[PDB]
Amino acid sequence: GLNIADNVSQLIGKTPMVYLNSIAKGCVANIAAKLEIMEPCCSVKDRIGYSMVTDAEQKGFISPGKSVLVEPTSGNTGIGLAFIAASRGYRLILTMPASMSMERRVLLKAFGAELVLTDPAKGMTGAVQKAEEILKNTPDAYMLQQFDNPANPKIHYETTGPEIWDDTKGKVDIFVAGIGTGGTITGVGRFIKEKNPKTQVIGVEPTESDILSGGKPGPHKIQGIGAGFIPKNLDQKIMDEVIAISSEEAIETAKQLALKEGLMVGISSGAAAAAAIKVAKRPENAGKLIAVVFPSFGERYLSTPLFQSIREEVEKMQP
Amino acid sequence: AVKRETGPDGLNIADNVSQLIGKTPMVYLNSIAKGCVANIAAKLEIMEPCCSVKDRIGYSMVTDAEQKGFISPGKSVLVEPTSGNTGIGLAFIAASRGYRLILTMPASMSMERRVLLKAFGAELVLTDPAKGMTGAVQKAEEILKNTPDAYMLQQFDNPANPKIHYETTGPEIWDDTKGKVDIFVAGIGTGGTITGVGRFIKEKNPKTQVIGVEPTESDILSGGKPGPHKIQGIGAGFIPKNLDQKIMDEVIAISSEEAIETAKQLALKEGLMVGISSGAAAAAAIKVAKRPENAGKLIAVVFPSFGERYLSTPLFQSIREEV
Ligand SMILES: *Cc1c(COP(=O)(O)O)cnc(C)c1O
Ligand SMILES: *Cc1c(COP(=O)(O)O)cnc(C)c1O
């Protein structure tokens, strides 16, 4: 009975939290970041790929060797899915617009994932489409549907919320999280409000695609959040407030996380942290504790705008 | 600042990023070990805050120097010649504790690696590709000599590198295997890991075997010549001072292609995204676990770094053509 994992799946979750220090200068509340970046595959999606597979196995809808998993996604979910599929011997089909750059695709294939590329013009909607086409025809096919699947917010209610609740020893006052599939905010929010109805739950979205605030969907750079429609997995009743953060301000905060905290994080962690730092300057919050989710490591985004300013100075660096 | 329930009684929240270092999990190998007579449990340094075993020695070499008062933040300038993970581990520590950090490396170095280093605010000085590491080491010696409060870490010589392994990596594996690790397998670059863990583990139990790993193409510990290879992170081409050649019972030499192939299967069979040296170490581990002697015994092997860092190396170039 050794303290070793049987398999990669048992490594998921139980991520740690870290206080923000110098970047939190000025703030009257403490901020502790929940580092989903330290998931076996460096994002929060490692929890839902595990849980939507397992939830299904348990309900008896899927078995390894037989069922074929199918999901329209390239992002972090495809990755969370790919490594779970590798390790468990489920065949996996992931659809995405051809647009997808080599980087995520190389990594997805290295996991044995079959890639089906759809039409770049058609974006996500074209990908859901091929995937409904592939589900609708393929013998043993099974779709996860990350925006509708109750097991997405369920895993967060079962692990992520209790982790934050345990690590802060019930002291958490405010929980801040960006909304993509809505699963984090909903499962954590639900869990924490049942422990303590007084806690505040605060969502974050792009200023360029603020549909929960009211606005309409528009282009934005915050990879991971503002999917452009209200996802079924979002319980909007759970939130106390939504804060809109700009792309520029997400990217700037992400860079300061690296430069000041030594935390290498993605643009969405930057947006969540920008909002938490704002919330931590409100006088009514002196002394309180804010927990904020950083959904993914930043090394994954070397080719995106997060690192562009840095890329420009590196390209001209003389030998 | 704002007061925090700190110390032994307070919250389970790291005070800063340094406190996230170490305590990494182990995972048994399953279908990739089909056919082995021994159990294999991998030590996953790929799950360090910045994805490599080197996060442990960025921390300990810097902390060792503060503790002895050789350096202090906002005044000392850290300087290291480093083409691999050591610059990353120094970079995030330097950022979080407020040191200026200059890293030297040949201008061969991929651009993504530079980008990352510079996101942490490290300063980069590029050296002459023809001169390799030796040329970078030379330029780091010059900067040290010419910079008023410069301090060089010297990852190959600094005894804080193996010492952090004696104090953390070794103990963890011993706690985690509840003292049942029969054999320990590790790639050698600086020798730190093999030295600290082997030392710690021999001390607890001298019966435990310790096996080190090098490239077939640069197999100097087996009596061969130094040359060029691809198992990045090991086979530095000389025997470094941080290697206590005394605690090793054996050296297995594994090839680029088998290292590469083994990393590929770890991805495909285990769901484990690892660098090429994790493949070399794993391959070595696998053979050992197939020696009849070792039936029913427990092997621990180190996986030094996460694979995603290497999307541009030979590891992924066959997968890169497919796309
Ligand atoms: C999924 C994701 C989010 C949002 O998390 P949800 O629980 O889906 O709302 C934010 N950032 C990144 C990088 C993500 O992958
Ligand atoms: C550091 C390094 C090694 C070797 O470990 P040492 O303790 O230096 O002997 C192996 N692989 C990689 C990727 C490394 O960065």
Q: What is the 3-state secondary structure (H, E, C) of chain A?
A: CCCCECCHHHHCCCCCEEECCHHHCCCCCEEEEEEHHHCCCCECHHHHHHHHHHHHHHCCCCCCCCCEEEEECCCHHHHHHHHHHHHHCCEEEEEEECCCCHHHHHHHHHCCCEEEEECHHHHHHHHHHHHHHHHHHCCCEEECCCCCCCHHHHHHHHHHHHHHHHHCCCCCCEEEEECCCCHHHHHHHHHHHHHCCCCEEEEEEECCCCCCCCCCCCCCCCCCCCCCCCCCCCCHHHCCEEEEECHHHHHHHHHHHHHHHCCCECHHHHHHHHHHHHHCCCHHHCCCEEEEEECEECHHHCCCHHHHHHHHHHCCCCC
Contact A19, B14 (CB under 8 A): yes
Contact B59, B94 (CB under 8 A): no
- CB contact set of A301 (below 8 Å; sequence gap of 6+): A223, A266, A267, A307
Contact A113, A107 (CB under 8 A): no
CA distance B320 to B316: 6
Name which of A85, A101, A20, A6 is nearest A52 in CA terms: A85
CA distance A4 to A18: 24
The ligand placed nearest to the CA atom of residue A203 is 1
Name which of B114, B95, B2 is nearest A256 in CA terms: B95
Burial of A125 (0-12, 13-18, 19+ CB in 10 A): exposed
Q: Answer positive or negative: Cα dihedral of A7, A13, A14, A18.
A: positive
Per DSSP, the three-state class of B128 is coil
Q: Is the CB of B234 under 6 A from ligand 2?
A: yes
CA distance A303 to A190: 36
Structure obtained using: X-ray
Burial of A216 (0-12, 13-18, 19+ CB in 10 A): exposed
CA distance A177 to A186: 10
| A227 φ, ψ (degrees, to nearest 5) | -70, -10
The distance from CA B253 to its chain's CA centroid, rounded to whole angstroms, is: 18
Continuous segment of H or E residues that includes residue B59: helix B55-67
Closest approach of B320 to chain A, Cα-based (Å): 6
Name which of B231, B235, B234, B232 is nearest B218 in CA terms: B235
Per domain, the residue ranges of chain A are 1-38+160-310, 39-146
CA distance B67 to B71: 9
Resolution in A: 2.4
Look up the CATH architecture of domain A39-146. Answer: 3-Layer(aba) Sandwich (3.40)
The distance from CA B128 to its chain's CA centroid, rounded to whole angstroms, is: 25
Contact A97, A119 (CB under 8 A): yes
For residue A28, CA distances in Å to A259, B62, B235 come to: 22, 31, 51
- CB contact set of A112 (below 8 Å; sequence gap of 6+): A82, A85, A86, A92, B267, B268
User: What DSSP state is assigned to residue B43?
Assistant: E
Do the first three CATH levels of B1-47+169-319 and B48-155 match, i.e. the same topology? yes
Burial of B181 (0-12, 13-18, 19+ CB in 10 A): buried
User: What DSSP state is assigned to residue B242?
Assistant: T
Contact B5, A32 (CB under 8 A): no
CA distance B32 to A319: 44
CB pairs under 8 A between A and B: 206
Name which of A164, A231, A167 is nearest A201 in CA terms: A164
For residue A47, CA distances in Å to A10, A13, A88, A143 come to: 10, 7, 15, 17
**In CATH, what number does B48-155 get?**
3.40.50.1100
Nearest atom of ligand 1 to the alpha carbon of A77: 15
Q: Which residue of B has its CA nearest to A100?
A: B323
Helices (H) and strands (E) counted in chain B, each on its own, are 10, 10
CATH topology of domain A1-38+160-310: Rossmann fold (3.40.50)
Closest approach of A213 to chain B, Cα-based (Å): 32
Q: How far is the CA of B140 from the centre of ligand 2 (A)?
A: 20
* Pairwise CB contact (< 8 Å): B320 & A102: yes
Per DSSP, the three-state class of B195 is helix
Q: Answer positive or negative: Cα dihedral of B40, B41, B47, B50.
A: negative
CATH, domain B1-47+169-319, list 3.40.47.40, 3.90.850.10, 3.90.1300.10, 3.40.50.1100: 3.40.50.1100
Take residue A77 and report the two structure tokens written for it.
């979910």
CA distance A114 to A91: 8
CA distance B182 to B294: 9
Contact A172, B13 (CB under 8 A): no
- Beta strands A241-245; A200-206: pairing state: parallel
CA distance A51 to A45: 10
User: What count of Cα atoms within 13 Å lies in the side-chain half-sphere of residue A9?
Assistant: 18
DSSP alpha helix (H) spans, B177-308: 192-204, 256-270, 276-288
